[PDB]
Amino acid sequence: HGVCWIYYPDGGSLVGEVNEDGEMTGEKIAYVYPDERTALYGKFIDGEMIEGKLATLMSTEEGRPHFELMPGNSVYHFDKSTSSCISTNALLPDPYESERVYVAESLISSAGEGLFSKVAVGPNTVMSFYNGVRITHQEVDSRDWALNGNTLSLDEETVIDVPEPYNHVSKYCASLGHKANHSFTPNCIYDMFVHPRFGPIKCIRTLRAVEADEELTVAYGYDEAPEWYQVELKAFQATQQKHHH
Amino acid sequence: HGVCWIYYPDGGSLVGEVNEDGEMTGEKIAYVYPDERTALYGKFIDGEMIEGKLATLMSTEEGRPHFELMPGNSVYHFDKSTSSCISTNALLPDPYESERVYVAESLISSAGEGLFSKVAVGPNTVMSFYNGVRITHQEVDSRDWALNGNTLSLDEETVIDVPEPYNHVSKYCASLGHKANHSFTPNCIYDMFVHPRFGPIKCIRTLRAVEADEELTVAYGYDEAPEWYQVELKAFQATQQKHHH
Ligand SMILES: N#Cc1cccc(C[C@@H](NS(=O)(=O)c2cc(F)c3c(c2)CCNC3)C(=O)N2CCCC2)c1
Ligand SMILES: N#Cc1cccc(C[C@@H](NS(=O)(=O)c2cc(F)c3c(c2)CCNC3)C(=O)N2CCCC2)c1
Ligand SMILES: C[S@@+](CC[C@H](N)C(=O)[O-])C[C@H]1O[C@@H](n2cnc3c(N)ncnc32)[C@H](O)[C@@H]1O
Ligand SMILES: C[S@@+](CC[C@H](N)C(=O)[O-])C[C@H]1O[C@@H](n2cnc3c(N)ncnc32)[C@H](O)[C@@H]1O
Numbered sequence: 001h002g003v004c005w006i007y008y009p010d011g012g013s014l015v016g017e018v019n020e021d022g023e024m025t026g027e028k029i030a031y032v033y034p035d036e037r038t039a040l041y042g043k044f045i046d047g048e049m050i051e052g053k054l055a056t057l058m059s060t061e062e063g064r065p066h067f068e069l070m071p072g073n074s075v076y077h078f079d080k081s082t083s084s085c086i087s088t089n090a091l092l093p094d095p096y097e098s099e100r101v102y103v104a105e106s107l108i109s110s111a112g113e114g115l116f117s118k119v120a121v122g123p124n125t126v127m128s129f130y131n132g133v134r135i136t137h138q139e140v141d142s143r144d145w146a147l148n149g150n151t152l153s154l155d156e157e158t159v160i161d162v163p164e165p166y167n168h169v170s171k172y173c174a175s176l177g178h179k180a181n182h183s184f185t186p187n188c189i190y191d192m193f194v195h196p197r198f199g200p201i202k203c204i205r206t207l208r209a210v211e212a213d214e215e216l217t218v219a220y221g222y223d224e225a226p227e228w229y230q231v232e233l234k235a236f237q238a239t240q241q242k243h244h245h
Numbered sequence: 246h247g248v249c250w251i252y253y254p255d256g257g258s259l260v261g262e263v264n265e266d267g268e269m270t271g272e273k274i275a276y277v278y279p280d281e282r283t284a285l286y287g288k289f290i291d292g293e294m295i296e297g298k299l300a301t302l303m304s305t306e307e308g309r310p311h312f313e314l315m316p317g318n319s320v321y322h323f324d325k326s327t328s329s330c331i332s333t334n335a336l337l338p339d340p341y342e343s344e345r346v347y348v349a350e351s352l353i354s355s356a357g358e359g360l361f362s363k364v365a366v367g368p369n370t371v372m373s374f375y376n377g378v379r380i381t382h383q384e385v386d387s388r389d390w391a392l393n394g395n396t397l398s399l400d401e402e403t404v405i406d407v408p409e410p411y412n413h414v415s416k417y418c419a420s421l422g423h424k425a426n427h428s429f430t431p432n433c434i435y436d437m438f439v440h441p442r443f444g445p446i447k448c449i450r451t452l453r454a455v456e457a458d459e460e461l462t463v464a465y466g467y468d469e470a471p472e473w474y475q476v477e478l479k480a481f482q483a484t485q486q487k488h489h490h
Contacts, residue, residue, distance in 0.1 A: 104488045116488050123468070184453065185430045208429065208464060213487040219453060223368070242458040243349045243361050 003063045006047075008194040010034060010126060010203065014047055015065055023047070030067060031196035032057050033096040034126045040076050040196055041067045049078045049196045054095055080199040081133050086162070090172040094197070100127045103169055103179050107215045111228075113169075115179040115216045121206055127188065127216060128204040129195060130177030132162040145224075150178045152190065152202060153221070160201060177204050182229065183217035184236045190218055248308045251292075253439040255279060255371060255448065259292055260310055268292070275312060276441035277302050278341040279371045285321050285441055286312045294323045294441045299340055325444040326378050331407070335417040339442070345372045348414055348424050352460045356473075358414075360424040360461045366451055372433065372461060373449040374440060375422030377407040390469075395423045397435065397447060398466070405446060422449050427474065428462035429481045435463055 004024070007013045013036075016029030029044035031052060040052030054074035055067040074095060079088050099118065106114030115128060130152055140151050140159050150162040166172035169179075175198065180188065187210055193203035204216060222229060249269070252258045258281075261274030274289035276297060285297030299319035300312040319340060324333050344363065351359030360373060375397055385396050385404050395407040411417035414424075420443065425433065432455055438448035449461060467474060 107486050107488070211482060211485065211487075213489075214485055215488070237456060240456065240459055241352050242456075243352070243460070244458075 001064075003065070005063070010191065010193045011036075012194060012196075014044075014196075016044065030055065030057075030065065032065075035096070038096045038099075039067055041069070042075075049076060052076045052196060076197050078199070079197055081131060083133055083135050086131070086133050086166050086172060087174045090166065090174055093173050094129055094175055096126075097128050097176060100125075101176055101216065103176060106181050108181055108183075111181050113179055114181045115176060115204070117210050117212055117214050117216055120211050121209070123206055123208050125206045125210075126191070126193070126203050127206060128177045128180065129175040129193060129198060130160060130190065130202040130204065131175040131195070131198040132160040132166070132178065135159050135161055149226075152178075154200070154202060174198075175201075177202065180204055180216050180218050182220040182232070184219060184233070186217045186219045187214065188216050188218045246309075248310070250308070255436065255438045256281075257439060257441075259289075259441075261289065275300065275302075275310065277310075280341070283341045283344075284312055286314070287320075294321060297321045297441060321442050323444070324442055326376060328378055328380050331376070331378050331411050331417060332419045335411065335419055338418050339374055339420055341371075342373050342421060345370075346421055346461065348421060351426050353426055353428075356426050358424055359426045360421060360449070362455050362457055362459050362461055365456050366454070368451055368453050370451045370455075371436070371438070371448050372451060373422045373425065374420040374438060374443060375405060375435065375447040375449065376420040376440070376443040377405040377411070377423065380404050380406055394471075397423075399445070399447060419443075420446075422447065425449055425461050425463050427465040427477070429464060429478070431462045431464045432459065433461050433463045 001017045004018050005013050005015045011034030013032045014024060015032060016024055016026060019025045024047040025045050027043050030039045030041040031049060032039045037057050039055040039057050040049060041055040042053045043051040054070040056070060057065055058068050059066045102116050102118050103113050104116055106112060137159055140148055150167055152160045154160050162178040187208055188204045188206050190202045191205045193201050195201050246262045249263050250258050250260045256279030258277045259269060260277060261269055261271060264270045269292040270290050272288050275284045275286040276294060277284045282302050284300040284302050285294060286300040287298045288296040299315040301315060302310055303313050304311045347361050347363050348358050349361055351357060382404055385393055395412055397405045399405050407423040432453055433449045433451050435447045436450045438446050440446050449463060
């Protein structure tokens with residue numbers, strides 16, 4: 001039997017025997033996260049996750065992976081957001097993300113909640129996912145800008161948003177990327193991600209080695225900006241040491 | 246007459262009328278730096294700079310550039326380093342770099358000289374060039390590691406080095422990239438660059454908007470490291486604020 005591995009730029013992969021028609025369809029197909037260990041294994045149709053059970057990639061022999069199911073009954077399916085629906089299981093967390101990050105009070109004064117590393121990781125490590133409702137740039141630009149705290153550009157056409165009430169973990173915790181605060185000295189970046197549950201979204205990826213319990217921060221893309229950002233920029237600029245002539 | 250623009254990934258370009266044979270050969274060819282304004286204009290042979298005089302790209306009309314020579318008699322040619330020769334005019338500075346950076350005492354204690362921004366720039370701006378002698382990785386790895394303070398990897402085969410006495414500006418100042426110190430909170434990165442004088446080298450490019458007289462720093466690529474780096478890493482790690490459980 002002939003196995004295909006399709007790796008995404010982000011390091012994740014779809015792996016399985018293609019059927020007679022060349023489609024990734026069957027009962028023993030898997031998505032493997034970028035750690036090359038955490039997997040969602042089970043029923044897929046044309047590469048789409050129907051019933052992916054939490055599993056571990058234990059070994060591979062001549063391209064053929066061996067998966068072992070994790071204890072419990074964690075199971076996932078393709079559940080792309082719409083403009084109006086964020087998730088059909090908003091409180092079901094992502095298992096890869098849950099091992100790597102947690103939400104707590106931000107270390108930045110008055111900045112609400114932030115996102116923190118649960119464990120030590122090296123540079124270029126995917127930590128968290130930024131999923132949300134899919135809206136147009138035109139819709140974001142034309143509406144009240146007070147509504148645009150969590151609007152992250154996906155591409156030239158699409159913005160990913162986490163609107164009220166989903167910006168609270170008691171209502172939405174399937175992904176947690178929207179909890180990372182801004183810093184001008186960030187330790188993470190936003191990057192593209194192809195997720196088996198969320199579809200094409202963005203992720204948070206480290207820029208350096210990060211120790212456990214550090215806050216994860218990203219430099220936000222303003223280039224008008226919110227007042228808190230204007231204030232922090234002026235303060236950052238004043239803080240920088242300079243050569244004196 | 247038919248003009249060709251060849252842009253490099255770094256934003257610089259070669260521009261000129263191709264000759265009957267399709268080669269970038271003639272007396273009116275130019276290299277234009279990534280600012281799309283600073284240019285080296287004159288005699289090129291098959292895309293190679295023979296006599297490039299300092300000039301400004303003033304305008305373009307239907308692909309045809311108009312250059313105006315700068316005052317003075319600044320002129321440059323292709324002068325790729327060897328394993329043993331860094332430059333045939335080591336003290337002739339790069340004109341683009343000279344407008345953007347200067348060397349002074351580093352703001353990092355006991356870290357010698359550093360590299361500083363001369364002017365305010367936005368993110369993703371090329372500031373400085375990292376040229377030097379071209380040696381193999383095998384040569385760098387096998388020799389005394391005390392000789393490897395300025396060794397920057399160019400590719401899988403080649404390392405760029407600025408050995409003694411060329412690490413002093415009184416002996417070498419054609420490029421200044423080797424003056425940028427390390428930081429775990431850098432404001433620049435190393436990037437690839439195709440230079441008309443130096444050939445394929447690396448550059449220093451900003452990661453954020455940088456104000457005038459800020460020190461330019463990059464996160465060095467260790468991933469054994471020098472003792473100063475081990476010491477600074479432990480100190481950086483201890484300095485980071487953490488969430489407390
Ligand atoms: N312009 C703009 C703009 C509008 C809203 C939000 C932002 C910040 C956004 N910058 S963005 O590049 O993703 C962006 C987000 C957007 F919603 C839009 C634009 C750009 C372009 C203009 N149209 C809307 C960012 O980095 N964020 C917000 C969530 C946490 C981090 C920028
Ligand atoms: N390993 C290693 C190594 C050896 C020497 C220097 C460095 C640091 C180098 N890191 S490197 O990725 O460019 C590098 C530079 C190297 F010379 C070598 C390697 C890697 C791989 C091993 N072979 C040699 C760097 O970022 N520098 C030095 C000049 C100022 C910034 C790393
Ligand atoms: C993507 S959310 C980040 C998580 C948010 N702090 C929370 O509690 O849900 C972006 C919002 O966080 C706040 N924020 C992010 N970075 C900040 C910073 N550096 N300083 C102050 N507020 C910040 C602003 O309210 C902004 O609209
Ligand atoms: C590429 S050179 C940088 C310029 C150098 N400081 C000079 O004066 O020429 C690298 C050398 O600078 C020093 N250096 C760079 N960053 C440092 C740092 N953060 N702390 C201490 N020394 C540093 C080390 O001596 C290292 O070998």
